[PDB]
């Protein structure tokens, strides 16, 4: 009966809870009680790029740590060169409402999407010298919140409806569809080995999925409200998420529970973007009170503050070589800090 | 700098010129966000897979209209995209009284329309935007109140079963849902199927909001 199935599900959830409790011995904050603190670290703004004329939603660093892509509140997909500040490309979008961007590791393609409900794939290296619409992937029912490139032929998208999709580029068909969520999926992150990926939705739960098999492996809970940004550790064995509770949370994949909580009493605004530093000693979190904070990943004390913005930070990223961190906010400017 | 770097600089300058020209062109366009109780009166207001845009023009002014009734998701996670709209159009059907249980749950259309209006016109983001609320079903209402009185809702008195005070009570009850009576205004226009003066009303409202914004900008309001 339905009541019997519900009771069995509750018993299974209690079983998961007691297994997680049994697997735990101590706390990560307890073990890292003899490691010297990072002290105080002070970045400064080395470049400022001011080409946009509206709010900036998404950004993504290239694989060469020299190029940037940014999406605005108009037909404005701008590809910048960071070192010399000259802007390389300007792409006009058919739909002015965008919320996501991604740069392919091959440096050939860029993905855009938003409230327009379809994911547009643009190619940059063509004979005619312009930028053309390579593909227009369709099939979702709600708005796209994040899109990432697996390779030059596989793309993974998370939509407003409780679904995730892995696509095919030559023929625009969903090769695989993931349906396990109850609530809008807001963030998506990919593993270093391009075999697993983590999705974060509006129901305060983070789900880890297998790319090829097509079924979920683990579900983590603990957040008070919806989560908006998820980032992988460089190792691939841990991940940190940010929510609207003014708290960030670091979970581990193998132990299947939470490890650290980053939160302070003064800050009450939400978190819009989260990224990790190389070697995973720092955690950069963009808050809604026009700031951008830096936390020590091994112990919860707070390091320097990157306060240079006049509006809320909407995106932030760290290069593959770990040189500089680039933050874009709702004011048209975005900055590079070193 | 080498020759190639100089040419790259020139390319950046040209792209900047084009971007500035496009932004200046796009700045002279007022935006209206259209909301309604599904298929209530929106189709008529538009007659004269995601969101759908309309690009009508009138009297040396370019209008851009967004219809987002096809989203069917959590509206609190994307409403902030529309923070800079010039105005909000709200469509409510006057025939919505009786005709109860249109939604799956047992409640009148009118109460859910009121709930939507209260959600929109007291939102955190829309603290300085006006509403151009339309009332769509003007001549079905006469027959409905002829055949059936106002009893299924509004426990308070409606006066009588004539169109005048019935419409007056409906408009008064809708116009007082808002709390910030100073920072925003409601226009409360009635409309019928054969009316051909809706765009004039929208033009007047838009001009009023533009004048108010200009006065507030120069430090005089």
């Amino acid at each position, epitope marked *: 009966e339905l009541d019997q199935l519900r009771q069995e599900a509750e018993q299974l959830k209690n079983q998961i809870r007691d297994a997680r409790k049994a697997c735990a011995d101590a706390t990560l904050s307890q073990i890292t009680n003899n490691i010297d603190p990072v002290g105080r670290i002070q970045m400064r703004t080395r470049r400022t790029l001011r080409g946009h004329l509206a709010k900036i939603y998404a950004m993504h660093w290239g694989t060469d740590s020299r190029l940037l892509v940014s999406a605005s509140q108009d037909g404005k997909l701008i590809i910048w*060169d960071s070192y010399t500040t000259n802007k390389v*490309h300007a792409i006009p979008l058919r739909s002015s409402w965008v919320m996501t961007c991604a740069y392919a590791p091959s440096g050939n393609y860029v993905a855009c999407g938003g409230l327009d409900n379809i994911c547009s794939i643009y190619n940059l290296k063509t004979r005619e*010298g312009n930028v053309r619409v390579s593909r227009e992937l369709a099939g979702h029912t709600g708005y796209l919140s994040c899109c990432r490139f697996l390779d030059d032929n596989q793309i993974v998208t998370s939509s407003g409806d409780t679904t995730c999709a892995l696509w095919d580029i030559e023929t625009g068909q969903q090769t695989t569809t993931f349906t396990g969520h109850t609530g809008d999926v807001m963030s998506l992150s990919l593993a270093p080995d391009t075999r697993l990926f983590v999705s974060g939705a509006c129901d305060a739960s983070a789900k880890l999925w297998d790319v090829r098999e097509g079924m979920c492996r683990q579900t983590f809970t603990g957040h008070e409200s919806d989560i908006n940004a998820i980032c992988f550790f460089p190792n691939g064995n841990a991940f940190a998420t940010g929510s609207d509770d003014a708290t960030c949370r670091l979970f581990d994949l193998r132990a299947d529970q939470e490890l650290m909580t980053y939160s302070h009493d003064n800050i009450i605004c939400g978190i819009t973007s989260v990224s990790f530093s190389k070697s995973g000693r720092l955690l950069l979190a963009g808050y809604d009170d026009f700031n951008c904070n830096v936390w020590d990943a091994l112990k919860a004390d707070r390091a320097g503050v990157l306060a240079g913005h006049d509006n809320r930070v909407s995106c932030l990223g760290v290069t593959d070589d770990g040189m500089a961190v680039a933050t874009g906010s709702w004011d048209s400017f975005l900055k590079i800090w070193n | 700098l080498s*020759a*190639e770097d*100089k*040419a790259a600089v*020139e390319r950046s300058k*040209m792209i900047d010129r084009n971007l500035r020209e496009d932004g200046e062109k796009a700045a002279r366009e007022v935006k209206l966000l259209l909301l309604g109780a599904g298929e209530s009166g929106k189709s008529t207001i538009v007659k004269q897979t995601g969101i759908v845009e309309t690009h009508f023009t009138f009297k040396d002014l370019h209008f851009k209209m967004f219809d987002v009734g096809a989203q069917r998701s959590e509206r609190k996670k994307w409403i902030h995209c529309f923070e800079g709209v010039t105005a909000i159009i709200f469509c409510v059907a006057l025939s919505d009284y009786d005709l109860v249980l249109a939604e799956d749950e047992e409640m009148n259309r009118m109460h859910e329309s009121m709930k939507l209006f209260d959600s929109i016109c007291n939102n955190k983001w829309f603290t300085d935007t006006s509403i151009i609320l339309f009332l769509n079903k003007k001549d079905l209402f006469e027959e409905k109140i002829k055949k059936s009185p106002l009893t299924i809702c509004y426990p308070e008195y409606a006066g009588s079963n004539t169109y005048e005070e019935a419409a007056a009570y409906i408009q008064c009850q809708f116009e007082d849902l808002n709390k910030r009576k100073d920072t925003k205004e409601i226009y409360t226009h009635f409309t019928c199927s054969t009316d051909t003066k809706n765009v004039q009303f929208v033009f007047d409202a838009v001009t009023d909001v533009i004048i108010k914004n200009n006065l507030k900008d120069c430090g005089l309001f």
Partner: single-chain antibody
Amino acid sequence: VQLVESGGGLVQPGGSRKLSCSASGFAFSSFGMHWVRQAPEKGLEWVAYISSGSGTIYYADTVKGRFTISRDDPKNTLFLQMTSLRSEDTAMYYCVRSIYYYGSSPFDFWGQGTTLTVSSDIVMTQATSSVPVTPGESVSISCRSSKSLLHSNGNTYLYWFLQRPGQSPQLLIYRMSNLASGVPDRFSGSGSGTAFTLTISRLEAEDVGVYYCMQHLEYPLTFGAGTKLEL
């Protein structure tokens, strides 16, 4: 990706001429243009450069004042104008497209060119003038520059062009290390300041002609004498 030329022919001294280039198949407004002259039995030499948007115009030291070059965008045409025509210019002209941004490959496509007959600066040295060869071997060609072409930004500026018999040249290596598009992986380039080597491994047919090394550090463009390979 199709450029055509017209207006050439036989002229008398003191006349004026109008050479026209028509483009089809790409975005003209984003591509700058070059005019490069080739003598009937000598090497390449540059004539003129126009940038995108008609902002910067450069002429050679032996053509300034006489020559005048413009372009019309809506009709997609490129005009060059000849005044006080003399006996030193009897040669055949080429138009070259080029775009400049990070990762670009200037001097990508070359038109056929047209013939016209009548009735300091960095010097590039080509070591050799003729090298017989047989298929299945490896060939190294050396090109020397008077001053170092390695700019302070870590970027080197040398372009290798190949001219097969009866055919407009094509790009082989740009910036001394980068392979062009549509070219096999056999070719390679290396060297250092004031010394450059082009290496070909596993020679095959359709590989005879002349090879040219060009600098791009500062105007005017200077090429080499020309190195040939024969079967």
